[PDB]
């Protein structure tokens, strides 16, 4: 039974039934997510930027079967074309406004990776894709305003692949957090 979290703490809580099992219920997590109503002081320890990056701050390790994080995006600041490692990606927007571009799995063959479509998301609306949908790139276009997002993977990951757009030619990398549970980890 979903009921609206009351604050972020509260969201943690039910994520962690909802994770007990050994499947994902895709649409009552990304429902969960969205009712969350955003509250900055709730998540102001995380959100930790850096001025050339965004950067990526461990909030919770759902007991194995999740990571919960909080992505902060300065003015300007993104990401390459990337997939998830064959892992369930929930992307809900704390603070700003991120576009969200998808890409198509390249052929084998060299070729520019043309934009399959583009959205805008939008403060506490939660996203959702994984390899079976595609690829993508998320950017925070502002020129006044950073961003905060608050991202579920499932299982959790740290590795990914980021992709060239020239050529769709694709290179492993390792993410890393800049912190976690609320402190910096060089
Ligand atoms: N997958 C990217 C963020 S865009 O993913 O919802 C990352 O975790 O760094
Ligand atoms: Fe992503």
């Given at each position: ?21 050994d ?12 009712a969350?109503?955003?509250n ?23 007991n ?100 060239d ?16 549970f ?5």
């Amino acid at each position: 039974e979903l009921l609206k979290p009351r604050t972020l703490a509260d969201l943690i809580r039910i994520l962690h039934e909802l994770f007990a099992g050994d499947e994902v219920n895709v649409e009552e997590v990304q429902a969960v997510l969205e009712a969350y109503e955003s509250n900055p002081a709730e998540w102001a320890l995380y959100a930790k930027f850096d001025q050339y990056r965004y950067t990526r701050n461990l909030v919770d390790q759902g007991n194995g079967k999740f990571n919960l994080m909080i992505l902060c995006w300065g003015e300007g600041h993104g990401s390459s074309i990337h997939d998830h490692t064959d892992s369930h990606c929930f992307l809900k927007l704390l603070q700003g406004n991120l576009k969200e571009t998808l890409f198509d799995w390249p052929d084998k063959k060299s070729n520019e990776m043309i934009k399959k479509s583009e959205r805008t998301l939008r403060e506490n609306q939660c996203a959702y894709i994984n390899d079976s949908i595609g690829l993508h790139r998320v950017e925070n276009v502002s020129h006044t305003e950073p961003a905060v997002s608050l991202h579920l993977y499932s299982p959790p990951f740290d590795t990914c692949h980021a992709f060239d757009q020239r050529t769709g030619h694709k290179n492993k990398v390792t993410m890393t957090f800049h912190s976690k549970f609320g402190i910096r980890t060089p």
